[PDB]
Design a protein around this ligand. Structure first.
Ligand SMILES: O=P(O)(O)O[C@H]1[C@H](OP(=O)(O)O)[C@@H](OP(=O)(O)O)[C@H](OP(=O)(O)O)[C@@H](OP(=O)(O)O)[C@H]1OP(=O)(O)O
Ligand SMILES: [Mg+2]
Ligand SMILES: [Mg+2]
Ligand SMILES: [Mg+2]
Ligand SMILES: [Mg+2]
Ligand SMILES: [Mg+2]
Ligand SMILES: [Zn+2]
Ligand SMILES: [Zn+2]
Ligand SMILES: [Zn+2]
Lengths: 50, 261, 292, 71, 193, 49, 145
RNA sequence: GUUCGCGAAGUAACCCUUCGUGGACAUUUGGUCAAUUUGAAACAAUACAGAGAUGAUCAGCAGUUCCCCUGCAUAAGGAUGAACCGUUUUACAAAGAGAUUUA
């Protein structure tokens, strides 16, 4: 099948983008790989201060 | 053929005889966008359908038969189609030849052409889901249908067996007195969708009863989609037929791989 | 990405037989049936002179995750529904594969935007992983109430009369009907026997089967059909007292008949479901008394 | 219209009218039956209060008998 | 159709385009039934048009003389600030009302030379230009206002509304900055954990 | 008589009981958790029984 | 589309709201095309929705500037004369209709009636010979090539 | 149906009428959509609850939220718009004593 794709001449009074509403979505995070958090070192002595 | 193909379909309701588009007034002002009544309370909103299908009477050839229409007239089922033989959709009980035409189409939408939805409605009413090939109807609200006649518990099933037998081939009919409700299972889904809209808001009166003049005053019965059958005497029949359906599909599917190779 | 969007997934049998098909694109048409979120509605017609618009009901992401077309929502390979697909794979891997779907709107949207496949959509869309499972289907084919007062009712059931030619009756009494064997299947078997096919037009026969009492009755109009129903049944069983009973023969089942000689009618098998079960239990013995 | 959610009982049961009308007055008892039945089992601890509320229940339940009696 | 889609059915439009409540309202109604400056200015604009078309109707029916008709349009266009009440939704139109009152002075002492103080004047052409130019300037304004309103009716309003700073929330935002900068410079000088 | 659910305050209110809420599945690992899933499901169906 | 309560009207109900943004444009094309005092009726060319949402007056009024100045000069003199000789001039009442009654249909209550005389000056026969044929036409000299 | 041909018949005398027969002209509408209950407006009303920081009464700004409403609005209102006011246990070790086990 070879398909001819055209556009509909819409009524300029009926709203364009009929399925379009102001809806809120939460998005999943796609993680395939873990980024290693590449710090360095194990000083660390704590003078009880701070 | 002799009952259906011989004659043409008849005008059920005259176009002046059709009901008014506004509903019965259950509010203070009419709402124009949403065609309902607004202020005050909301009452009941259910009434007995004034019109009913006489299937061996109203069936006949229509305009959709010559066009090769796939879908049945929604208001043929309600007994309300005013176009008669001039109507674009079909006017007859679905048959094996007819559902064979709907076979690629029935998966996502009903026999009336309305699109099925993802999940069922909360009260199991309406069109139905494409996720489950439901062939069983919950016949409920029988007291308001009968106009509060008592009768017995098995005569009620006798009314159910006579009415739904005209609307297609039946798998089984079960009536439960303690739950005052019936479960009708059909051979095909398309009959079940057809009989659902045919028997919504109807009455099981049979004019040999004395309340036949007051058939309109009642509430009308609810035909809705059935849930699963919870007894294991039926549960074991479900996976038995699901097994036979799977064996009938695998034979068809290895022939696809036979041709694919 | 609103400017880089996949082509729609549609079946071959959705598109039909013709070569060129004029399809209409609407960039934000309807919202998805599954994920309730908008998409590009394509719709088209098979021929030019058809009368049915075939719309795409679900978005491409919900069609990808299930590996189904957007129009008829059948699987892209094997062309079977999703519920039957995930049941066929579960017979192969011996574990349940199942695409589960949200009932909540914020989780119908959430489950679509992830890039996984669902259910059997890992098995299908891999032609290698599909074809070997078809071979694994092939080896499966190589295997190939004592307190009730029921005495008011059994007086009306015949249970004591013979199936001969000589009584000229309208109705009959069907017992030994299993909880399977649907109501249409018995009516087709009788109509196949008489050649009175499309019987529902003329209403030649009316049949009532309880499926709880394991009993039924079929009623004929025009009593001359009764002798045709008798003469077209050859196999009978004689109880060792006498009283021969014809057998109706649906596949692998056996149903016994007696000329009822009246119009039994609904409530003849019973008036309550707890009462109906004991009628099946009451015959269990008589079937064993008829055979053995 | 006219709601039945506005007015009183009305006091005498025999003076009420046709059966499709007293049906809605009857359910106009049953809701307060349902509401104050849920108000029985509450652990809210006021034993004097739930005693007078128990008497109101017995009063309304006797009315519910009377509306059924008229029908 | 707009009022009934918003759910307001206790607001009555008469056929002379006045919006009046049918009953005394709870405050949850009065918060729901605030129609903005777009709807009312659109309603006052149709009211002016209905007011002019009806005078041409009453001439056409034979009820009005042709000289009374010309005075009728000349009475309308000088007194739209009195007959309609469009001024409250855009007070900028008081410029046009001053224009239609000024032309009225210019026309009359030319017109009412030597014939008294009757109401006979009907030279409505200059005041007709002023409202025709005002309609020119508030085509694009009202297309924007009502284009936002109906797309808010058909799609809801945006979840992503971000509040710009103004005079009222200046010190409040100055706090949220000042908290965050001291958060960073101390969480960077802690030891660890 | 079944327990009534709480009424939805807004349109997209979530029945948390109805589904895995925001199912962040764990990342696919190598050590083959195949027998372990069978034993939780057998234990979890045992707990519901 | 007088009383639209059927289910078929659902798209057309949307169309009326969607045409509301265009409605100040239609008012501009209506008030600029308003008939001037000399003419009884004026036939304008309109563009309408097939669902009948809005009706735009699809014309712009072109006039000849010396012709238009004389036409209003003639009606200036006519109203200046009419105000002088009338004993009492009755200004019409505003608003012209009751707000309770709907705007009356054109084809039943207006189309059948004869219009009325327009505000045409007496006109000289000798001094104004060249212009008296066509001065009060709706479009003056419209077909004079 | 028009228009160009060709043929036959009659009136004709090459024109008119009739019906046979080639051409040419003109070429695939509409639907995302079917007409009351069962595919989804809301609000009023009954009843109950009674109102941020406080001892007490009164101005408010914000902030976070998979809550939004009105408004043309990125202005501003919506009770400071609302919700918040609860639940609360392990990166856990080092050192020093009396009962009890082990084998
Ligand atoms: O303030 P005044 O000296 O009394 O002037 C009035 C006043 O003038 P404006 O029309 O400019 O306002 C009248 O207007 P109202 O405020 O009373 O409506 C107007 O009445 P008309 O519009 O009916 O003409 C009338 O004009 P006239 O006398 O021509 O009727 C005119 O008085 P003078 O024109 O005599 O100065
Ligand atoms: Mg403030
Ligand atoms: Mg605020
Ligand atoms: Mg305030
Ligand atoms: Mg706040
Ligand atoms: Mg305050
Ligand atoms: Zn029809
Ligand atoms: Zn989707
Ligand atoms: Zn498909």
């Amino acid at each position: 099948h070879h398909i001819e794709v055209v556009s509909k001449q819409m009524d300029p009074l009926l709203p364009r983008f009929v399925g379009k509403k102001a809806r809120k979505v939460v998005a999943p995070t796609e993680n395939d790989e873990v980024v290693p958090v590449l710090h360095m070192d194990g000083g660390e002595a704590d003078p009880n201060e701070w | 053929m002799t009952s259906w193909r011989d004659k043409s379909a008849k005008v059920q309701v005259k176009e002046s005889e059709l009901p008014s588009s506004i509903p019965a007034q259950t509010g203070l002002t009419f709402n124009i966008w949403y065609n309902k009544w607004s202020q005050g309370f909301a009452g009941n909103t259910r009434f007995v359908s004034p019109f009913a299908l006489q299937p061996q009477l109203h069936s006949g050839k229509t305009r959709g038969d010559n066009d090769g229409q796939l879908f049945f007239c929604l208001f043929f089922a309600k007994g309300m189609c005013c176009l008669g033989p001039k109507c674009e959709y079909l006017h007859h009980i679905p048959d094996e030849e007819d559902i064979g035409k709907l076979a690629l189409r029935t998966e996502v939408l009903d026999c009336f052409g309305r699109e099925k939805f993802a999940d069922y409605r909360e009260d199991m009413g309406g069109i139905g889901s494409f996720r489950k090939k439901n062939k069983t109807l919950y016949v409920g609200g029988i007291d308001g249908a009968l106009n509060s006649k008592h009768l017995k518990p098995a005569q009620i099933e006798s009314r159910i067996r006579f009415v739904f037998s005209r609307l297609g081939d039946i798998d089984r009919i079960r009536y439960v007195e303690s739950k005052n409700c019936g479960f009708v299972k059909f051979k095909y889904q398309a009959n079940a969708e057809f009989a659902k809209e045919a028997m919504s808001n109807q009455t099981l009166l049979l004019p040999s009863d004395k309340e036949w003049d007051d058939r309109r005053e009642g509430t009308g019965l609810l035909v809705k989609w059935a849930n699963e059958d919870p007894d294991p005497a039926a549960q074991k029949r479900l996976q038995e037929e699901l097994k036979l359906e799977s064996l009938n599909m695998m034979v068809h599917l290895i022939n696809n791989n036979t041709n694919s190779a | 990405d609103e400017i880089n969007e996949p082509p729609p997934n549609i079946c071959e049998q959705c598109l039909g037989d013709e070569a060129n098909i004029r399809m209409t694109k609407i960039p934000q048409g309807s919202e998805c049936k599954i994920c309730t979120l908008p998409f590009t509605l394509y719709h088209f017609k098979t021929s030019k002179r058809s009368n049915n618009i075939i719309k795409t009901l679900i978005c491409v992401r919900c069609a990808t995750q299930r590996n189904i077309c957007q129009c008829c929502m059948l699987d892209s390979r094997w062309h079977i529904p999703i519920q039957l697909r995930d049941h066929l794979i579960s017979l192969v891997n011996e574990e349940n594969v199942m695409t589960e779907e949200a009932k909540n709107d914020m989780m119908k949207r959430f489950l679509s935007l992830k890039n996984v496949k669902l259910g059997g959509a890992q098995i299908t869309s891999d032609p290698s992983e599909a074809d070997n499972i078809v071979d694994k289907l092939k080896n499966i084919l190589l295997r190939a109430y004592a307190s009730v007062d029921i005495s008011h009712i059994l007086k009306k059931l015949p249970l004591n009369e013979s199936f001969l030619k000589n009584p000229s009756t309208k109705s009959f009494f069907l017992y030994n009907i299993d909880a399977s064997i649907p109501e249409w299947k018995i009516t087709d078997t009788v109509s196949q026997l008489l050649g009175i096919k499309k019987w529902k037009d003329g209403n030649s026969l009316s049949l009532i089967v309880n499926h709880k009492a394991k009993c039924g009755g079929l009623r004929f109009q025009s009593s001359e059909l009764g002798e045709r129903f008798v003469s077209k049944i050859s196999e009978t069983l004689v109880t060792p007292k006498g009283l021969k009973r014809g057998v109706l023969l649906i596949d692998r089942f056996r149903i016994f008949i007696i000329p009822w000689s009246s119009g039994f009618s609904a409530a003849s098998f019973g008036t309550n479901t707890a009462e109906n079960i004991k009628l099946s239990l009451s015959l269990n013995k008589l079937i064993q008394l008829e055979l053995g | 219209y006219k709601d039945y959610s506005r007015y009183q009982r009305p006091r005498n049961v025999s003076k009420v009218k046709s059966i499709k009308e007293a049906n809605e007055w009857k359910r106009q008892v049953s809701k307060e039956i349902k509401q104050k039945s849920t108000r029985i089992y509450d652990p809210s601890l006021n034993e004097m209060q739930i005693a007078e509320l128990n008497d109101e229940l017995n009063n309304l339940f006797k009315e519910w008998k009377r509306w059924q009696w008229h029908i | 159709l707009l009022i009934h889609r918003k759910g307001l059915t206790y607001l009555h439009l008469d056929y002379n385009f006045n919006l009046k409540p049918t009953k005394t309202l709870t405050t949850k109604e009065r918060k729901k039934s605030r129609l903005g400056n777009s709807f009312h200015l659109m309603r006052e604009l149709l009211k002016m048009m209905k007011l002019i078309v009806d005078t041409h109707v009453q001439f056409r029916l034979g009820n009005v003389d042709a000289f009374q008709l010309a005075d009728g349009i000349h009475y309308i266009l000088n007194h739209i600030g009195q007959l309609t009440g469009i001024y409250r939704y855009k007070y900028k139109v008081m410029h046009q009302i001053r224009a239609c009152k000024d032309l009225k002075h210019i026309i009359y002492y030319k017109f009412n030379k030597n014939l008294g103080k009757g109401p006979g004047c009907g030279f409505w052409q200059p005041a007709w230009r002023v409202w025709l130019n005002f309609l020119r300037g508030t085509i694009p304004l009202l297309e924007r206002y009502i284009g936002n309103l109906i797309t808010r009716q058909f799609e809801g309003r945006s979840n992503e509304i971000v509040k710009t700073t103004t005079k009222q929330r200046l010190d409040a935002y100055y706090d949220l900055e000042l908290r965050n900068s001291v958060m960073d410079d101390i969480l960077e000088m802690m030891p660890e954990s | 008589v079944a327990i009534k659910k709480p009424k939805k305050k807004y349109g997209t209110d979530i029945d948390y009981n109805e589904d895995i809420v925001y199912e962040q599945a764990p990342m696919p690992g190598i050590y083959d958790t195949s027998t372990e899933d069978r034993q939780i499901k057998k234990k979890f169906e045992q707990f519901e029984r | 589309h007088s009383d639209m309560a059927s289910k078929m009207y659902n798209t057309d109900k949307k169309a009326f709201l969607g045409a509301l943004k265009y409605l100040p444009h239609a008012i501009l094309k209506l008030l600029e095309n308003m008939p001037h005092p000399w003419e009884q009726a004026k036939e304008v060319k309109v563009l309408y929705h097939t669902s009948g949402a809005i009706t735009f007056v699809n014309e712009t009024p072109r006039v000849i500037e010396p012709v238009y100045t004389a036409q209003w000069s003639a009606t200036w003199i006519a109203m200046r004369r009419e105000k002088r000789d009338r004993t009492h001039f009755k200004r019409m009442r505003f608003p012209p209709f009751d707000d309770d009654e709907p705007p009356l249909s054109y084809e039943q209550h207006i189309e059948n009636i004869e219009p009325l005389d327009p505000i045409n000056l007496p006109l000289d026969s000798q001094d104004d010979e060249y212009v008296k044929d066509w001065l009060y036409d709706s479009r003056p000299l419209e077909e004079d090539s």
